[PDB]
Design an enzyme around this catalytic site. Sequence first.
Site, mmCIF file in Angstrom:
data_model
loop_
_atom_site.group_PDB
_atom_site.id
_atom_site.type_symbol
_atom_site.label_atom_id
_atom_site.label_comp_id
_atom_site.label_asym_id
_atom_site.label_seq_id
_atom_site.Cartn_x
_atom_site.Cartn_y
_atom_site.Cartn_z
ATOM 1 N N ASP A 1 -1.963 2.928 -1.845
ATOM 2 C CA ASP A 1 -3.236 2.983 -1.150
ATOM 3 C C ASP A 1 -4.221 2.159 -1.975
ATOM 4 O O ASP A 1 -3.809 1.301 -2.757
ATOM 5 C CB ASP A 1 -3.618 4.456 -0.923
ATOM 6 C CG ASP A 1 -4.590 4.638 0.222
ATOM 7 O OD1 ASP A 1 -5.798 4.392 0.014
ATOM 8 O OD2 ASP A 1 -4.149 5.042 1.326
ATOM 9 N N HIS B 1 -3.911 -1.304 -1.744
ATOM 10 C CA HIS B 1 -4.828 -1.713 -0.697
ATOM 11 C C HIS B 1 -6.062 -2.432 -1.213
ATOM 12 O O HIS B 1 -6.946 -2.765 -0.411
ATOM 13 C CB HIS B 1 -5.223 -0.518 0.181
ATOM 14 C CG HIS B 1 -4.070 0.096 0.923
ATOM 15 N ND1 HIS B 1 -4.221 1.189 1.747
ATOM 16 C CD2 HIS B 1 -2.756 -0.230 0.967
ATOM 17 C CE1 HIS B 1 -3.048 1.506 2.272
ATOM 18 N NE2 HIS B 1 -2.143 0.666 1.810
#
Length: 390
Positions: free
Chosen positions: A195, A218
């Site tokens: 993430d 991310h």
Amino acid sequence: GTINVLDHGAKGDGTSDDTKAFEDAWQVACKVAASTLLVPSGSTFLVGPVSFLGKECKEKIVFQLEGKIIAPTSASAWGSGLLQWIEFKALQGITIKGKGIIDGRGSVWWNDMMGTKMPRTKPTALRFYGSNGVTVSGITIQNSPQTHLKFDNCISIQVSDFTTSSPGDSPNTDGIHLQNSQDAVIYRSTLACGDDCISIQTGCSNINIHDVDCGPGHGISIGGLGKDNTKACVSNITVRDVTMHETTNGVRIKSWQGGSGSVKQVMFSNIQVSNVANPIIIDQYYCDGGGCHNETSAVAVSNINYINIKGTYTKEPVRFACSDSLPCTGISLSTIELKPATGKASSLDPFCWKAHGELKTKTLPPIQCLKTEKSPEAASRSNNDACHHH
Ligand SMILES: *[C@@H]1O[C@H](CO)[C@@H](O[C@@H]2O[C@H](CO)[C@@H](O[C@@H]3O[C@H](CO[C@H]4O[C@H](CO[C@H]5O[C@H](CO)[C@@H](O)[C@H](O)[C@@H]5O)[C@@H](O)[C@H](O[C@H]5O[C@H](CO)[C@@H](O)[C@H](O)[C@@H]5O)[C@@H]4O)[C@@H](O)[C@H](O[C@H]4O[C@H](CO)[C@@H](O)[C@H](O)[C@@H]4O)[C@@H]3O)[C@H](O)[C@H]2NC(C)=O)[C@H](O)[C@H]1NC(C)=O
Ligand SMILES: *[C@@H]1O[C@H](CO)[C@@H](O)[C@H](O)[C@H]1NC(C)=O
């Protein structure tokens, strides 16, 4: 004088539950300023949910992690709540340092093998709450159930020589999460995540990130801010000398329709992106995991600066998608050299929607859609900011 957990009942075999032994060693260290609790090299310790609580503890304690701490892998062995793993709370001048490892064995959660219906949000591996002067250096956190390292209500934070390692396809395994925390520097760190590598939430100011490599993951994000019609306040964020390798975003600001407050005075500089989908993105229509409708309030985005950002991209190279009712203002770009990684990406132009600012150089690709005029609409919403502490 060092307090080795093996002298306080820890077995260090990776199979016996050593939680109580760690609690007992902590009580010894808690009473002595500048004491050192050693989790020794060459031993592995099975430790369940544990809180090193410290309002009454002395200052300058060192938790020296040189061995390995591993999490339990069954709901029974975890215990009540599933609400935390390792926490340090209400401490002054606490340091976690060493070249050891915290291994959350998170695949048991990612694979739904815990023997219980899991919570939507799984335990953070290492969380600091309510502490003044927090240092995390040297250690590696791997395979977290969800977030690797969290700071909540902390001030004066230094993270260095620090590593996260969870698979790029592990769910929601963000690296470092900061919330309601101020005066932080994160540097000389390597973040491999499923993430956001770093995410900065409401209540954060004076956060400085430099000399960091992110990937997989991310990217580095502010937000998502303002979910559930809440006020968000973020200011004075600097990111410098960072690389993002095959991440979904580079530098991102994300906010929810209906939020209020502001994110302002952000500097993203000296960023190298390699094969990143969305290198530069402000998204005031963010709604992952929720409803995707529009509302009349927004978090006000202003004074966001991008300087010396270079590399390759696979989706829109630049996306400034700002609220219809509160345009972004004061966006500035200089020295942007982004090149498409594919023929398909080369047809994807910068996207600007309700975005005001300036180009200080020519950019690659050319960004022709930023509005140079002022926004009376944005200015008229100023009473919805009210981030007075920022
Ligand atoms: C919540 O609110 C939001 C915000 O209001 C709302 O989302 C908006 O919805 C509107 C309406 O659907 C969107 O506006 C439309 O966008 C259409 C698509 O535009 C994009 O794509 C165009 C084509 O791009 C491709 O092709 C070109 C080749 O031409 C290529 O280069 C590109 O790279 C790409 O491959 C593109 O032209 C367009 O670019 C313009 O606009 C952007 C954004 O401002 C700017 O960056 C550019 O410089 C350029 O000016 C954009 O990239 C579009 O077709 C459509 O246009 C028609 O209608 C308008 C009037 O409405 C006419 O003026 C126009 O002449 C066309 O006839 C229209 O503009 C808008 O983009 C959404 N905004 C966001 C942020 O999502 C949500 O729907 C709301 N949600 C709910 C639930 O209510
Ligand atoms: C951020 O720092 C600048 C410059 O020191 C200052 O003007 C501003 O008030 C600060 N904002 C905070 C600390 O929220």
